[PDB]
Amino acid sequence: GAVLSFHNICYRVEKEILSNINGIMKPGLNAILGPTGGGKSSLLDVLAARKDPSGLSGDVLINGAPRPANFKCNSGYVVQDDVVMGTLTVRENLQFSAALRLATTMTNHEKNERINRVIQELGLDKVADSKVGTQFIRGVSGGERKRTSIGMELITDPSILFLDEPTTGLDSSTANAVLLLLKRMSKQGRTIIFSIHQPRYSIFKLFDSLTLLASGRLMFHGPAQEALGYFESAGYHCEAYNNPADFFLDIINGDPLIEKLAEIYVNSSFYKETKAELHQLSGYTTSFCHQLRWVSKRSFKNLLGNPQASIAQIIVTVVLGLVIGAIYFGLKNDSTGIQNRAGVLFFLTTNQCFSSVSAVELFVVEKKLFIHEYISGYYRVSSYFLGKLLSDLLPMRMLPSIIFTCIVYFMLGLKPKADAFFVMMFTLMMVAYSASSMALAIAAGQSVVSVATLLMTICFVFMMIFSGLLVNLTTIASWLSWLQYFSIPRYGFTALQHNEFLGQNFCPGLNATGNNPCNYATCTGEEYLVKQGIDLSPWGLWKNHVALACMIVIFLTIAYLKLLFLKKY
Amino acid sequence: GAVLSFHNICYRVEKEILSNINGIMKPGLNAILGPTGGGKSSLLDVLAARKDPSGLSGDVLINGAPRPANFKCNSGYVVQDDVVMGTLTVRENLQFSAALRLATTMTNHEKNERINRVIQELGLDKVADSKVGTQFIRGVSGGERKRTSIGMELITDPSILFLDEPTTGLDSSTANAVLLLLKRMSKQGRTIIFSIHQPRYSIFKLFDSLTLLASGRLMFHGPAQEALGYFESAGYHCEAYNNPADFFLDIINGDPLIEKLAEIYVNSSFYKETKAELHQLSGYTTSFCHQLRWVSKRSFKNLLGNPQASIAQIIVTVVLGLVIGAIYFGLKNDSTGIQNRAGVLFFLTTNQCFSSVSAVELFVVEKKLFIHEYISGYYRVSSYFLGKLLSDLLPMRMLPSIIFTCIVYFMLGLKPKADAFFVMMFTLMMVAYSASSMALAIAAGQSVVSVATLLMTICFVFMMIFSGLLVNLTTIASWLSWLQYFSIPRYGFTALQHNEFLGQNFCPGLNATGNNPCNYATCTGEEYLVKQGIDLSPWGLWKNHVALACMIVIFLTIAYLKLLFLKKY
């Protein structure tokens, strides 16, 4: 089997969370234990290479050789809080893990067989076709979600398996079942390493090695059955009916003292034996397209499975379209035509911009999962980015524009030509994409959403002021005019105006015989446009669209760089 | 001491969470134990009268007499999740509790002495002058927050003290310290009643009575020390090094069975003895002004202590004011004057309306605390409502209007008279108050905020469309025009227009010699107003303000009725 032998570890983050730690984790159900403040999860990550190598200051050595570069890929790790996708079926999650982790050369049949074997081992065949739990509804119980995570890691038939708090939040019976399962797995020769919180003695009866850590020091390392003898030799005695694990924790808590216990251990025989043994010992798979395909499939399944956001979006869009069609129904080429036309176009543009502050949740929600799967070697960050965009951002931002136009354009009696119709659709879509892209660039690489939302709203108000309606941009001062070139709504609104007002007459019965509209009348659309600053040449419309495209590219690239320079360790 | 003797309890919510429960809770450290699904907190609330009496179907009797009407006031209850105010100092929270609970007749000196005694008993004198923990920063540790809650309840020197999960989320040492404190309190003759989750044997060694509940049935009731003997007599045996509490939970879990255990208990000697004993036994302070003063003081201290919301509000308001002053600087009486003036007024109005969707959090956040203190008899709901409004809603909604006007009115070159200036200020304030009041009426009596926020935004968009700028209300159809009378921004915007445009000329160099402005020019403000539907008489402005006031009153009354008919039990 595998023999993971740490030695003289010291990790500096210059607070030193772990001071001096040596041991050997032979095959079996090895364990790590101690108070919450003690560096147990930290040590676990150190052994699994999930922590920045800079602070590390010791020699980790497996089976007599230094850790291979591909270690994380050939050794599983199970996070504390399950990251499985509730909106998917158990077998679907295992299938995703199998498809990306296992080699491409293998056939789909072999991978399906392996998945069946794993489900059989973990006893999940009952729920192999059930939802894993949206947490709005729970297709499976907590224990089965945990077993599913363990299965995802087990797909590649790992030799070394790390776990963090495998029994936390579970009921006593569920925890016992999980740990008995781990004991069965270890009997096969698989080295299991894990951390726990105040285990029961039925659980503690099953261990093969113990590692007790407090304030970053090694109180004990050796066979669990003999830990009680060691402490009793130290003088501390355990009354019956008291769980020995709690007894160790009491001894640590003093119910300073901790350094005294460390000194005792260094004087111990176990330490000498372990040190002698240590000195004796010292003596991507897949292509880009495949990753993109699979992550996009998973994202779309989640998108469908969670109907709240999508369905609410479509319904609100339709209702707004119908209401606006009723209110602005039958626009007239009279004194009030200009007001209503500009108003509706402004409203549509702002609705597209302000309805995209819900894109912050795209990457904020799935930060932990992305980090875990990137470290574990599932996929690159490029494939995650493009697949997630192509599955979530593209369709649900393209739809509202189509709904709005199809509903309003004919109820409102806007221009009857088709070239104008599709320009309206394209312009609204580009506004939505650019706004959502900006939201991504602002929200990417963040775990808190509120700050991002506030920032987006503030930015959008300051953009809205510089839209043509409220301010008459020709009037703004020169030292402030240049900010108008940073506004998405300005480009969209200007394009829509240039599409609609051109070739419209708003002075009925002028008769042009006196030929005097007083020069204060705004009797034509061209005149209104030039008075608002717009350009009547065909270049104006297309330059607005061009600017929107450039903003899209800029913001998406920023988001990618923010993900690629995120702290993943 | 006190002797709380329940008997033949049965509670129906017609799922019957509690089936049949009898016992006697003599003075000391009585306890309630069992699985999470078991009705332990439910039984606790039943005994403390925190549950609707309708479902209850048994006789609760204290010291031989039925529960007095003023029981909740003379018996403390400690909620699971601490409700203390982080933004206050420990002694301040205890002072608030002392001021409202203790009688008015007492002097302040006596109440201060009592507070000092309580702090001395609980050993909080060290942190008597420290912040209780915003959870952005923690002035005190979790154990001290818990001790503070217990002190708030202890102020009135209660005879009967109920607790719920006093050790959940605490560390082992902290939990032991808390329970040892409770043991010290009980040694003085105070009946303590509480519920716990998987206690340690060091804790379990301290009890005086035990009540084991599973699936709403009484597995055991008697001395804790003898529970192990009872179960061993039943046949189930406990291996050493196993916590007896976990042993009982295992027996319940089967590691149906539960009904079998209930049958055993009914056959037991303890049940017969308890039944015989039971049959033998059966054989506002303060004035309104005081409550208002104290709750308002606490609310203002919290408002100051948490600077995020307030300071961000002021800063954003100032920045917007300066930006708008720069952009619209020097309004001119030319063709573009009308556009810019209407735009800025519309923007200010909408900013006041849309910045008030942050008032939903006023009562949403503090629902649990309000319910707890109302049941416990601290204050009426009227005083809470008025004090909370008078402390939070009034000043922070009045300030932005003043900032906006003082900043913009002179940079923009609006009307130079003062009567107009103060009308602008008053109108903006009333808009803010009415909008916040509507948000309260929508959010009061809710624990989820997101739905309220979405509703508020939707309402405000539909209000905005019917503002005069985008739609030319004179044009809307008759069967839809009547909705314009439900819009706050319409009233505010109309009032501002009527204040500004009156007596303004927007056609420079007309010379009035030809006297022909083409009738399409809008050469005067009065003409613009009449074309938009407004009335030039003085009544229009004041009727808009009147409507806003009526909306304020309506919505506030609705909020009060929603709080007064909330489910507090």
Ligand SMILES: COc1cc2c(cc1OC)CN(CCc1ccc(NC(=O)c3cc(OC)c(OC)cc3NC(=O)c3cnc4ccccc4c3)cc1)CC2
């Ligand atoms: C610290 O400082 C501040 C903090 C906060 C606020 C204000 C502050 O300081 C002031 C107010 N927060 C409100 C959060 C929020 C989010 C989304 C919306 N929903 C739309 O905004 C909208 C949606 C449309 O369709 C869905 C639409 O279609 C036409 C037009 C829309 N909005 C406008 O037109 C408009 C105009 N002015 C505004 C001024 C301030 C805030 C929002 C404004 C919105 C509204 C409010 C919360 C925190």
Ligand SMILES: Nc1ncnc2c1ncn2[C@@H]1O[C@H](COP(=O)(O)OP(=O)(O)OP(=O)(O)O)[C@@H](O)[C@H]1O
């Ligand atoms: N990246 C980091 N930066 C600063 N301090 C850290 C970092 N990682 C760990 N620490 C410190 O190391 C100590 C050990 O924390 P540890 O990881 O053991 O938490 P834990 O509660 O034991 O984990 P678990 O959630 O499994 O119980 C903590 O006091 C923590 O402040």
Ligand SMILES: Nc1ncnc2c1ncn2[C@@H]1O[C@H](COP(=O)(O)OP(=O)(O)OP(=O)(O)O)[C@@H](O)[C@H]1O
């Ligand atoms: N108001 C209510 N309406 C419907 N069911 C209720 C209500 N109150 C309690 N119950 C039911 O009673 C059962 C007992 O819940 P209980 O109050 O014991 O929760 P608990 O987890 O034991 O409390 P704690 O948070 O202290 O652990 C639950 O199954 C719950 O569904």
Ligand SMILES: CC(C)CCC[C@@H](C)[C@H]1CC[C@H]2[C@@H]3CC=C4C[C@@H](O)CC[C@]4(C)[C@H]3CC[C@]12C
């Ligand atoms: C880092 C962030 C702010 C990106 C900001 C990029 C903005 C300011 C840039 C991106 C592309 C740019 C546009 C590219 C093309 C043209 C056509 C030209 O004849 C007028 C300016 C105009 C319309 C530019 C305005 C400024 C612009 C929109």
Ligand SMILES: CC(C)CCC[C@@H](C)[C@H]1CC[C@H]2[C@@H]3CC=C4C[C@@H](O)CC[C@]4(C)[C@H]3CC[C@]12C
């Ligand atoms: C229950 C909720 C919706 C409260 C809604 C109340 C609204 C619709 C009511 C409250 C007071 C009312 C106003 C009372 C007085 C006047 C003066 C009158 O010459 C024109 C109508 C006008 C301006 C009313 C319009 C409708 C109004 C604003």
